[PDB]
């Protein structure tokens, strides 16, 4: 799904996706009837005339390579996995945009009596990126209440973006998504309307155009075969059950307040493999990293 | 004044109507000293918007519904890009100016009372286009009639087609399904499949092109029992006999090019065609269930020398075959009849025990290990 | 080495420049035994700079784009070209393609000598070189390799020193001035193709949808804006831009077997002039150049010439099509019931407006306001009478292209119109800026002697009490204008001289109460004072046709 959910391309340079112009090329040579200028070949003038936004450009800016996801190393903070959009306007207006991921696979922490599999963190980052690829990112002011900061003396409430709640998985998302919707916002209706509009645009205009290559047409066909309600219901609680991976579940986006982490170094011919942690999550032999003394403690 | 009866009528005046004051909208070309100039255009979604001129009795919806029922469905026909092109060769040591305008099909809905039309609403459908040329010298004055048109005129077909708006051969086939290829080149009556008409002037050339910028094609289905011979069911049996894979889409282009002689003007008519597949169900010498599938094909071209009008009624709904006579009968495996297989070539003697299958006539698939009479 | 003066000069050497060592960098085609090979290019959108210390790249770009065709922002227009060649009966033919370029030099001349020169190369059409070869044959190296930049086209050196009476009525007008307009100094040049003997070559101009740019030059952007001019063009001719972007043109030339042929192609424009003729003088003008379908020229195989001044050249036939359009400022009131024999329309703002109406039968009518004041102007919708129609009622066709018939634009004078109206047509009547005396427009069928004054306004000046003179707008040639007057003196049963000042037949009628009696015909009113004695107190009708309009106004002198 990540590999087929290309951001929606823009139409031709004049707007629209329906059909390009026509070019008459290759007039036949004259004969006894002569004037075979009209007996020639017909060509779609702009072929694949749609303009894509998911592309990386070479240093010389004369070559382009399609790209939906690029995974980088961490930014300033060594242990902080992040997902960033390419265009902010296109991540919220339904166009969709490519995502860049900051992921650190060499460190992990221990919760209770098990270690956190980095596969689940990468999966969470990919699920979050699926929002940007579909252009259904909510506004930054759609925070829902997450925790009453009882440690404080003034009544203040921590807030959490709805994407974090939806993709983090656990009991917190199931206390918000209820059988009737106690919490509702115009974001869901607007996103559904935009998604349906783009699906209709594809089905009526792109699907049927004979001057667009299958590389974009077929990928857009599979992109819209998934209902928008499926992406909202896609959380870590599904992959944790489908992978048998144990992870923190309650207030998992605020664990910095609860306990202080202690990170472990993971090398990856030995400590982690295609089958996951060697000798299981619980019994894998790991060594505490030397960066535990470099943690910044700002209370 | 008309000789019809009191009531409402839908009338088609044909193709080749050019609107007033709309001659040099698209522009023109200048050629000189034997140079050949080719103009072309494509009718997609903006030069294909019809023009409605309604009356209180005949609103826009009333006009759109009635003409599309009797004549070509222009709503579904203008969605497919269609190209056209003209070519003119300038004479030796002379200059030629040639400009292109749009041609239209003119439909009307009229009301007749006491042999006199007392009301008329007019719809214009952009059909193909037209090219007008002249040989001029620098400084020469040309009559304004060449440049300007002060009234709508017909140039290709003078016609008036009206319809009142009413408010045993021995077939030695064994029993089983058959898919008969009845032939290619079927067109609907009343010019419902006309791509359009082009008037090529003397010494010029014209061409109508299906550029296939869109895959969309419209097959036709006429069944006698939708319970058994559904559209999907008929399509599956078409993929079984002749292995037809693409039904609603196509990717094959077709051009129709006509070079008019140097003496007389010619007009050319391009139609969309169909191939007729008959899915029958033979039982004891008589057909008990028949379905007809018209698969879109690669068009038909009619060339006619350009010619008082006569009010003629429209022919009944039906098809006319313009292609050659064809009859290819291919039997197909009747579904809902399980196929058993023997996974070994029969060498010289084999026995097959029928499994349980509890009547239900079935098929055994097999092959032999050596050619011979068994 | 130069006949110029001291200073910096910008020179164009034309297209057809072939760069060195770049011959077979695009590839080649091998064809055999009667097969026809067609090779070409089609681009939707990179020049080559060679500067000097004084002439930096920005300097060169600015100076070249100031005079000659732009290339930084004008690269949007796509181009295409094609070359076709047929192999001999039993031999192979190899043909290869390269790009030709436009060379733009910028030089500094001191003491009539070129002491400095910077060169810019702008991409242009292509060039195909072919040879018929047998296997094993050795081909001269000069066919494949070019060791020095050369021009294989028409050499040129274009340098620049770097340092009548309109008898119209008041209202808007749209004039189609023709086709084939091209900008000066080859600013609209698609390019030139050289075709060798026995070959044929084609230049194709693809047009991307909604990628056509017209040229607008307005006299006053306050009123005659680009959107306003486009709307008025749509009102006049139904001109829309989006229908020019779906077209395409293509020029094909087959060079003879003896000599090579050079074919040159330009883009073109159609000129539309939106004018605001008022009181005989054009108070506003706008020029709109709509992209047309190209221009072709055929030529054949170094005088330093100066560039021409900026402007347009018409390569198409002479054209002047004038269409009057409805002023959008004025409102339109419609009379739904068709006029049959009489009517009295009651005007409901003291502002000019257009009354749209139709007649129930053909006939000569007589339209006038209350006490013949104000004076009305009657137009005719062009093309109306074939679309939607209901018997006995008015069905508006939304036609705003009006053709003037008769009337005066001087509300001070009082007059009435006598115009023949066709049953299957729609007509407009313009009421000028009036007062609040509640005037009304009266329509009356005229089956009497008034049919003589067909299509002619009739003035009713009756101040004759004593040579009096009256000035109006002179009608166009073959038109008519009439005057109603009363001879001073009580009727009892006076030599009057009737003539004109500047403009050239005339007819006189006697009103016998409307039972006009014809008296005198075919009078040359050019000053001719041939006088006539008429009975005092008798109303007289004087009809004058226009045969030689030497002035916008017309003056009638009565003695």
mmCIF file with all atom_site columns, N, CA, C and O in Angstrom, chain B residues 80-95:
data_model
loop_
_atom_site.group_PDB
_atom_site.id
_atom_site.type_symbol
_atom_site.label_atom_id
_atom_site.label_alt_id
_atom_site.label_comp_id
_atom_site.label_asym_id
_atom_site.label_entity_id
_atom_site.label_seq_id
_atom_site.pdbx_PDB_ins_code
_atom_site.Cartn_x
_atom_site.Cartn_y
_atom_site.Cartn_z
_atom_site.occupancy
_atom_site.B_iso_or_equiv
_atom_site.pdbx_formal_charge
_atom_site.auth_seq_id
_atom_site.auth_comp_id
_atom_site.auth_asym_id
_atom_site.auth_atom_id
_atom_site.pdbx_PDB_model_num
ATOM 1  N N  . UNK B 1 80 ? -15.973 11.552 -26.253 1.00 0.00 ? 80 UNK B N  1
ATOM 2  C CA . UNK B 1 80 ? -14.840 10.876 -26.880 1.00 0.00 ? 80 UNK B CA 1
ATOM 3  C C  . UNK B 1 80 ? -14.173 11.863 -27.832 1.00 0.00 ? 80 UNK B C  1
ATOM 4  O O  . UNK B 1 80 ? -14.826 12.325 -28.780 1.00 0.00 ? 80 UNK B O  1
ATOM 5  N N  . UNK B 1 81 ? -12.909 12.222 -27.616 1.00 0.00 ? 81 UNK B N  1
ATOM 6  C CA . UNK B 1 81 ? -12.227 13.126 -28.549 1.00 0.00 ? 81 UNK B CA 1
ATOM 7  C C  . UNK B 1 81 ? -12.202 12.556 -29.958 1.00 0.00 ? 81 UNK B C  1
ATOM 8  O O  . UNK B 1 81 ? -11.887 11.384 -30.171 1.00 0.00 ? 81 UNK B O  1
ATOM 9  N N  . UNK B 1 82 ? -12.537 13.405 -30.924 1.00 0.00 ? 82 UNK B N  1
ATOM 10 C CA . UNK B 1 82 ? -12.509 13.060 -32.337 1.00 0.00 ? 82 UNK B CA 1
ATOM 11 C C  . UNK B 1 82 ? -11.736 14.152 -33.056 1.00 0.00 ? 82 UNK B C  1
ATOM 12 O O  . UNK B 1 82 ? -11.967 15.342 -32.811 1.00 0.00 ? 82 UNK B O  1
ATOM 13 N N  . UNK B 1 83 ? -10.804 13.757 -33.918 1.00 0.00 ? 83 UNK B N  1
ATOM 14 C CA . UNK B 1 83 ? -9.993  14.704 -34.649 1.00 0.00 ? 83 UNK B CA 1
ATOM 15 C C  . UNK B 1 83 ? -10.430 14.802 -36.097 1.00 0.00 ? 83 UNK B C  1
ATOM 16 O O  . UNK B 1 83 ? -10.979 13.863 -36.660 1.00 0.00 ? 83 UNK B O  1
ATOM 17 N N  . UNK B 1 84 ? -10.180 15.959 -36.697 1.00 0.00 ? 84 UNK B N  1
ATOM 18 C CA . UNK B 1 84 ? -10.402 16.121 -38.123 1.00 0.00 ? 84 UNK B CA 1
ATOM 19 C C  . UNK B 1 84 ? -9.323  17.031 -38.683 1.00 0.00 ? 84 UNK B C  1
ATOM 20 O O  . UNK B 1 84 ? -8.744  17.852 -37.966 1.00 0.00 ? 84 UNK B O  1
ATOM 21 N N  . UNK B 1 85 ? -9.044  16.859 -39.971 1.00 0.00 ? 85 UNK B N  1
ATOM 22 C CA . UNK B 1 85 ? -7.957  17.590 -40.602 1.00 0.00 ? 85 UNK B CA 1
ATOM 23 C C  . UNK B 1 85 ? -8.288  17.850 -42.062 1.00 0.00 ? 85 UNK B C  1
ATOM 24 O O  . UNK B 1 85 ? -8.927  17.034 -42.729 1.00 0.00 ? 85 UNK B O  1
ATOM 25 N N  . UNK B 1 86 ? -7.841  19.005 -42.546 1.00 0.00 ? 86 UNK B N  1
ATOM 26 C CA . UNK B 1 86 ? -7.959  19.386 -43.943 1.00 0.00 ? 86 UNK B CA 1
ATOM 27 C C  . UNK B 1 86 ? -6.583  19.752 -44.477 1.00 0.00 ? 86 UNK B C  1
ATOM 28 O O  . UNK B 1 86 ? -5.717  20.224 -43.737 1.00 0.00 ? 86 UNK B O  1
ATOM 29 N N  . UNK B 1 87 ? -6.390  19.521 -45.771 1.00 0.00 ? 87 UNK B N  1
ATOM 30 C CA . UNK B 1 87 ? -5.121  19.790 -46.429 1.00 0.00 ? 87 UNK B CA 1
ATOM 31 C C  . UNK B 1 87 ? -5.386  20.449 -47.771 1.00 0.00 ? 87 UNK B C  1
ATOM 32 O O  . UNK B 1 87 ? -6.165  19.929 -48.576 1.00 0.00 ? 87 UNK B O  1
ATOM 33 N N  . UNK B 1 88 ? -4.739  21.587 -48.008 1.00 0.00 ? 88 UNK B N  1
ATOM 34 C CA . UNK B 1 88 ? -4.881  22.316 -49.260 1.00 0.00 ? 88 UNK B CA 1
ATOM 35 C C  . UNK B 1 88 ? -3.508  22.715 -49.776 1.00 0.00 ? 88 UNK B C  1
ATOM 36 O O  . UNK B 1 88 ? -2.653  23.167 -49.010 1.00 0.00 ? 88 UNK B O  1
ATOM 37 N N  . UNK B 1 89 ? -3.304  22.553 -51.080 1.00 0.00 ? 89 UNK B N  1
ATOM 38 C CA . UNK B 1 89 ? -2.039  22.888 -51.721 1.00 0.00 ? 89 UNK B CA 1
ATOM 39 C C  . UNK B 1 89 ? -2.201  24.191 -52.492 1.00 0.00 ? 89 UNK B C  1
ATOM 40 O O  . UNK B 1 89 ? -3.067  24.295 -53.367 1.00 0.00 ? 89 UNK B O  1
ATOM 41 N N  . UNK B 1 90 ? -1.374  25.178 -52.164 1.00 0.00 ? 90 UNK B N  1
ATOM 42 C CA . UNK B 1 90 ? -1.419  26.444 -52.874 1.00 0.00 ? 90 UNK B CA 1
ATOM 43 C C  . UNK B 1 90 ? -0.938  26.255 -54.311 1.00 0.00 ? 90 UNK B C  1
ATOM 44 O O  . UNK B 1 90 ? -0.026  25.462 -54.561 1.00 0.00 ? 90 UNK B O  1
ATOM 45 N N  . UNK B 1 91 ? -1.531  26.959 -55.273 1.00 0.00 ? 91 UNK B N  1
ATOM 46 C CA . UNK B 1 91 ? -1.070  26.837 -56.662 1.00 0.00 ? 91 UNK B CA 1
ATOM 47 C C  . UNK B 1 91 ? 0.304   27.453 -56.872 1.00 0.00 ? 91 UNK B C  1
ATOM 48 O O  . UNK B 1 91 ? 0.871   28.051 -55.952 1.00 0.00 ? 91 UNK B O  1
ATOM 49 N N  . UNK B 1 92 ? 0.847   27.313 -58.076 1.00 0.00 ? 92 UNK B N  1
ATOM 50 C CA . UNK B 1 92 ? 2.178   27.824 -58.373 1.00 0.00 ? 92 UNK B CA 1
ATOM 51 C C  . UNK B 1 92 ? 2.139   29.338 -58.540 1.00 0.00 ? 92 UNK B C  1
ATOM 52 O O  . UNK B 1 92 ? 1.291   29.869 -59.264 1.00 0.00 ? 92 UNK B O  1
ATOM 53 N N  . UNK B 1 93 ? 3.060   30.026 -57.864 1.00 0.00 ? 93 UNK B N  1
ATOM 54 C CA . UNK B 1 93 ? 3.213   31.478 -57.942 1.00 0.00 ? 93 UNK B CA 1
ATOM 55 C C  . UNK B 1 93 ? 1.943   32.223 -57.542 1.00 0.00 ? 93 UNK B C  1
ATOM 56 O O  . UNK B 1 93 ? 1.661   33.302 -58.074 1.00 0.00 ? 93 UNK B O  1
ATOM 57 N N  . UNK B 1 94 ? 1.168   31.671 -56.613 1.00 0.00 ? 94 UNK B N  1
ATOM 58 C CA . UNK B 1 94 ? -0.044  32.306 -56.121 1.00 0.00 ? 94 UNK B CA 1
ATOM 59 C C  . UNK B 1 94 ? -0.158  32.073 -54.621 1.00 0.00 ? 94 UNK B C  1
ATOM 60 O O  . UNK B 1 94 ? 0.511   31.210 -54.049 1.00 0.00 ? 94 UNK B O  1
ATOM 61 N N  . UNK B 1 95 ? -1.018  32.861 -53.982 1.00 0.00 ? 95 UNK B N  1
ATOM 62 C CA . UNK B 1 95 ? -1.234  32.779 -52.547 1.00 0.00 ? 95 UNK B CA 1
ATOM 63 C C  . UNK B 1 95 ? -2.646  32.291 -52.261 1.00 0.00 ? 95 UNK B C  1
ATOM 64 O O  . UNK B 1 95 ? -3.597  32.629 -52.972 1.00 0.00 ? 95 UNK B O  1
#
